[PDB]
Design a binder for these strands. Structure first.
Ligand SMILES: Cc1cn([C@H]2C[C@H](O)[C@@H](COP(=O)(O)OP(=O)(O)OP(=O)(O)O)O2)c(=O)[nH]c1=O
Ligand SMILES: Cc1cn([C@H]2C[C@H](O)[C@@H](COP(=O)(O)OP(=O)(O)OP(=O)(O)O)O2)c(=O)[nH]c1=O
Ligand SMILES: [Mg+2]
Ligand SMILES: [Mg+2]
Ligand SMILES: [Zn+2]
Lengths: 412, 496, 474
RNA sequence: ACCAGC
DNA sequence: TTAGCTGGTCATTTTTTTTTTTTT
């Protein structure tokens, strides 16, 4: 509680400086209400006043998403140039003000904020819906503990340092505890190698087991960061266009075409699997110039446990075939990783040996009393993942990776 | 509260419009929202506009959520604030302008607050004394935390805060921002914080607003009254360590009295007409123009001009009021102003012209003019004759306390019954102070003059210390010889 | 305000109470009904006379406000008209309690209600004394609050003795115990309650543990400077007002300050001073100089010396390291500040000084009320209270400061000072005689030991300020 | 429409 | 002819009993 009130009192005196310094630059004006006028001032939170002030500052947007208005986001406020050099520095302050405003709205002043869901024992109880998505993915609400900013975002480490497991002293010794976080690396990309192994005869999952896939994908695709490469591969895989994956690298549609032609001719089994799924599900698709009329044949897909997975759109069938089969192995793994610990002779709960804290879509966060218990957990997680990979007769080899720490800033 | 999304109609989007439990919809794309005087002033009649304050800085949304609107009636500008109830109706109004014309219309209750018509549940609350600081805290906190303000000021906090008890009882912690004291609230709950400026508006307009928000969430305890612990005396004693005024006329007095201090009561007594005024006048003349201290006299026996003539004739070692030719000669040759200027160029002397009206004049002389030694004479006119003199001595002891002034008081003696009189050389006792018996209880130094006008030496006097708290040395100090030609009595070396 | 509201003109209707648990039969029997006027449904209670004449209405709204229809009488009781006799009545505090008791008893016992509440219950119970004479037992049923205990204590004084019995409840009153299902525990409180014992008198056998507790408590604080004083005083205990007097400027404040320093630096007792003769800085410098066996204010060169070599902090930390001392900064507010000094801080010794300014109309009634308030504050607190006073003018003879032996009837202002003070200690010395540094201690009054007279002799030191136990023989 | 997550 | 799956946002002057401490 104290570490987040210190952050709130830190970044509340920042946006009160970014409004006194900014309204003297971008002055007020009259707006038409005998003609009724009003003296309205510059509101940086509204996306309409900034558009009007960038019209009269000598800037052409050259991008029109709406039929009459340009788009205003983070990627158009970086490549913007005006004649007055004060506004060029003021746009960065506007972006910082919007970031601090979102930080305030998420952290403390929100209706579903952090400080309004703290119990008397200094803990947060969040609603975790096990089946909320259409692909069997669990959701989180009241509050949402799976959408806080990461370590790459500004004011990211100072927020994840407060959501720690070392803030719970033991009731018999008065000692903090140890947090272990275990993440799977390359889940859906290995499940894709499991599905299309009957087309390319299974020589695709061997390169994935041979070192890291995202690192050599970054090397072969000359992306600057690993995160941009991981974004680009799942953008290209789940049915992109010609510009939305050229937007990841920032270039035009020619680079977006040549990267698709490059990554398509490497492994010619994605299009064959897509054609097999389209031959399985749909039979006819009439085309409309403003809509689409599709006569369905089988709306549902049999999953890994016979569950009828629903399909919303026919060109997103690979999406609902991949991520719906990827959540069930994690859902069985989180069961088996405590079914082994209970049969081993441990005790679950705050008065015992370990306690589950957070389960986002990929990684788990467990908190335990001693480091030997964390060693037992990080040893048995690989055995549980191997039993998951062996129980449904997978052609691939599943693997995870765990981290040990005091809080949830190192173990991200 | 948010429920789900509906397709909009204005912008025509699919997931732009959102539906709520209250029945209203809101689109994120098209930005369309659906669904005395004794007279309360109408909003639309008096040209009500929600204009944002420019000279101090308050957004429009805070004025909309608080009800602080500007009227343009009669060609002038009024700032009407509204006080409401728990039901959600306008109870009273307050009108403020450039001349601060306090025109409080409507039924203004004795427990009127501001900002209580929206807030019933919570943990913290901030109470201020004005309205601009309250709106400033709403600006800093974006109008989402419970902050109220008094509707009558910090002068009548014993009535407004006392009448509202169950409203403040619903919360956990009450934080005050009055002055940078009301104990009607329950103890163990109220915190008081201190700002480095005058109020919150100065910290807002001078960039110290962070020091507002650091004091809200980390306010300090109550600390009721002037019960001072021993830890808070580190620098006050060191300042107090960094002085006795020397008694001129005799060196035997300062060997056992060590002068006078700040807040020191000196009492001067003798028989009927044995020369108290001459001795105190000599001490005043030797302390004023020879030591650089500002001395205020309150001689009530004579007038201002007569004691001025005394002082002038004394300092020039003559007898002015004892010869008409000496008074006539000094004005015919122009030497009168030479005695005036060299004595009154520094203006260390301040005389008084003639019972609670005296204490205000002494406070105006001490605080305003900045004097150090105040002298009072002839206490008999000022003062049942037991309660009045005790109340007078108590008020003068309270005035001399915590000020740093040397208070000299001239008193009298009572009539004896048996034995010899005081004019023949009787040794005076401590219990001869007439009027009361508390005059020797609050005085810190008591000096008595003894002489025999009918004996062998009618110009030999004796000084007797009767009470001394500082050292504890009382008795005969010495002997002094009076001059019948100059007035200046000199220290002698007479032996018994 | 206007008139008695008829149910026909106000759309009266008898219904049940879901939120409180009362069916429509009880409100039909009593006459507590609901009006539909001005949109908002108003609740209203009916009052009747002995014959049955409607005389008063009680109108309450949806937001807990009160509205009287006119002249509210003092003999107005809710439920008096229905019953005209019986052997056991139950008097309820509010109006829903009487309906709750009617619900849980099927309209059998004569149960009524008040018309004023807990604020003016004594007047309406004194004005209804003739109605309670025709009854045999009265069961008072009030709230489990401090105001309810005050009402059941003070309103049971104008009632006939031997017929008043008080029941207790675990809820606020009977209605939440009806809601929480405590319908069996309330009937035993109706049938078998407790009599009118806890008024304030005690039994001779109930003190047997508590007298033991006081037997296991109450040790006197030993004085310093003389061992002959403790031989006839045996210290100072809780609830002990000790009066100190002498002549004008004979050494009251010096002895009291030395006693305070010897209780502070040697016993660890938290001492609260209220010195009104001088301010905080002078007595602080006097304590600092007296602990170091010097005269601090009586040497300007020593004050200039000790501030340069930095040994002032060496004297400050050895005294105020534990914060055992708590000073006061300069009439009824002083009692509250001393109450906060005792309770909020936790001191054991409270010292005042120079009571004559505090009593500065008729001074005798003021000083008697002040001494009564200080005796009541010392009572049931367990604190030593030292009070310093002065003397009056003798008519004939020599002066008090010249070595005259002082009597007990020389305390000025009143005679009530010696009637409540426990131990009166007078100091005697002669500053104009032979030795002005030899003092005499005279015990004038002693309630506990009873040994009065000359205690001993002490010799004052003019250099160190430490008066020592001498061995002089008179 | 925007922000964050995986 | 389309990267997807979640959550969260702002809005209207009269008379008589008791006590004390100075002075004529
Ligand atoms: C970032 C991202 C991930 N995903 C999928 C990929 C994964 O199956 C899952 C989480 O992705 P990640 O955990 O970020 O990636 P990873 O597990 O393959 O690698 P590592 O643990 O070494 O960092 O969600 C999307 O579907 N869309 C996305 O935008
Ligand atoms: C007992 C005694 C005290 N003194 C000095 C030291 C004391 O500080 C000084 C008197 O100061 P206090 O002790 O303050 O005198 P007091 O309290 O009796 O009365 P008050 O303050 O109302 O006048 O007398 C002696 O010189 N010889 C002595 O024998
Ligand atoms: Mg991962
Ligand atoms: Mg004293
Ligand atoms: Zn819309």
């Amino acid at each position: 509680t104290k570490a987040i009130e210190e952050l709130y009192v830190e970044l509340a005196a920042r946006r009160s400086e970014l409004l006194r310094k900014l309204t003297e630059t971008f002055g007020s004006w009259y707006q038409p209400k005998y003609t009724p006028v009003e003296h309205v001032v510059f509101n940086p939170s509204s996306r309409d006043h900034i558009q009007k002030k960038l019209q009269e500052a000598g800037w052409v947007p050259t991008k029109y998403t709406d039929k009459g208005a340009p788009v205003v986001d983070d990627e158009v406020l970086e490549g913007v140039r005006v004649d007055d050099p004060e506004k060029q520095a003021a746009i960065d302050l506007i972006k910082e003000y919007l970031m601090i405003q979102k930080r305030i709205g998420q952290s403390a002043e929100g209706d579903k904020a952090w400080l309004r869901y703290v119990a008397e024992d200094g803990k947060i109880h969040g609603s975790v819906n096990p089946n909320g998505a259409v692909t069997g993915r669990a959701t989180h609400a009241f509050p949402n503990l799976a959408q806080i900013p990461g370590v790459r975002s500004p004011y990211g480490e100072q927020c994840r340092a407060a959501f720690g497991a070392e803030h719970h002293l033991d009731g018999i010794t008065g000692k903090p505890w140890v947090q272990a976080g275990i993440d799977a690396s390359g889940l859906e990309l290995r499940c894709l190698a499991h599905f299309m192994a009957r087309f390319d005869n299974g020589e695709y999952a061997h390169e994935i087991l041979n070192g890291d896939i995202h690192t050599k994908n970054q090397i072969a695709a000359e992306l600057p960061t690993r995160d941009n490469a991981k974004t680009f591969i799942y953008g290209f895989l789940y049915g992109a266009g010609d510009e939305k994956i050229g937007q990841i690298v920032g270039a035009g549609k020619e680079r977006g075409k040549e990267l698709k032609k490059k990554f398509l001719e490497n492994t010619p089994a994605i299009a064959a699997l897509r054609e097999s799924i389209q031959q399985t599900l749909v039979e006819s698709s009439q085309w409309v110039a403003g809509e689409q009329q599709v006569k369905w044949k089988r709306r549902w897909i049999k999953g890994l446990d016979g569950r009828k997975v629903h399909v919303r759109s026919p060109h997103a069938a690979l999406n609902t075939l991949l991520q719906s089969a990827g959540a069930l192995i994690c859902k069985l793994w989180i069961i088996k990783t405590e079914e082994m610990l209970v049969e081993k002779g441990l005790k679950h709960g705050w008065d015992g040996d370990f306690a589950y804290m957070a389960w986002v879509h990929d990684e788990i966060q467990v908190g335990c009393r001693t480091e030997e218990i964390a060693q037992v957990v990080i040893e048995t997680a690989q055995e549980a993942m191997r039993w998951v990979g062996d129980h449904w007769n997978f052609r691939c080899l599943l693997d995870t990776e765990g981290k040990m720490g005091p809080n949830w800033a190192i173990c991200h | 509260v948010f429920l789900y999304h509906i397709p909009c109609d204005n912008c025509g989007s699919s997931d732009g419009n959102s539906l709520f439990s209250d029945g209203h919809t809101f689109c994120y794309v098209c930005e369309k929202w659906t669904a005395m005087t004794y007279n309360v002033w109408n909003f639309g009649e008096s040209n009500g506009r929600y204009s944002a304050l420019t000279a101090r800085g308050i957004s429009k949304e805070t004025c909309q959520k608080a009800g602080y609107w500007i009227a343009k009636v009669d060609g002038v500008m009024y700032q009407v604030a509204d006080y409401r109830d728990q039901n959600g109706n306008i109870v009273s109004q307050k009108v403020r302008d450039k001349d601060k014309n306090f025109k409080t219309t409507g039924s203004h209750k004795s427990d009127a607050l501001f900002g209580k018509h929206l807030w019933n549940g919570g943990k913290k609350i901030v109470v201020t004394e004005g309205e601009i600081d309250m709106l400033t805290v709403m600006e800093l906190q974006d109008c989402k935390y419970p902050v109220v303000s008094l509707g009558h000021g910090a002068s009548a906090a014993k009535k407004t805060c006392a009448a509202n008890y169950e409203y403040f009882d619903q919360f956990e912690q009450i934080i005050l921002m009055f002055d940078m004291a009301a104990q009607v609230l329950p103890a163990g709950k109220v915190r008081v914080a201190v700002l480095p400026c005058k109020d919150a508006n100065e910290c807002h307009l001078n960039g110290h607003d962070r020091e507002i928000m650091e004091q809200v969430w980390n306010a300090g305890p109550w600390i009721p009254d002037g019960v001072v612990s021993a830890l808070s005396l580190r620098e006050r004693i060191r300042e107090h360590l960094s002085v006795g005024l020397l008694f001129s006329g005799c060196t035997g007095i300062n060997d056992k009295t060590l002068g006078a201090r700040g807040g020191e009561v000196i009492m001067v007594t003798s028989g009927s007409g044995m020369g108290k005024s001459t001795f105190v006048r000599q001490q005043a003349l030797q302390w004023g123009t020879a030591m650089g201290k500002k001395v205020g006299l309150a001689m009530l026996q004579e007038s201002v001009e007569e004691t001025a003539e005394d002082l002038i004739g004394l300092h020039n070692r003559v007898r002015l009021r004892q010869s008409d030719s000496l008074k006539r000669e000094i004005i015919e040759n122009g030497k009168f102003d030479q005695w005036f200027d060299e004595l009154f160029g520094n203006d260390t002397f301040h005389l008084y012209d003639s019972t609670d009206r005296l204490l205000a004049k002494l406070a105006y002389m001490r605080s305003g003019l900045g004097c150090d030694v105040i002298i009072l004479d002839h206490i008999s006119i000022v003062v049942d004759e037991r309660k009045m003199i005790d109340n007078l001595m108590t008020k003068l002891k309270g005035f001399a306390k915590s000020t740093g002034v040397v208070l000299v008081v001239i008193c009298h003696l009572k009539n004896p019954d048996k034995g010899k009189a005081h004019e023949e050389g009787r040794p005076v006792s401590i219990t001869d102070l007439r009027g009361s018996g508390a005059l020797r209880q609050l005085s810190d130094t008591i000096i008595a003059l003894e002489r025999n006008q009918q004996g062998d030496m009618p110009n030999l006097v004796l000084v007797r210390i009767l009470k001394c708290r500082f050292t504890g040395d009382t008795g005969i100090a010495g002997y002094m010889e009076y001059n019948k030609e100059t007035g200046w009595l000199e220290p002698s070396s007479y032996s018994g």
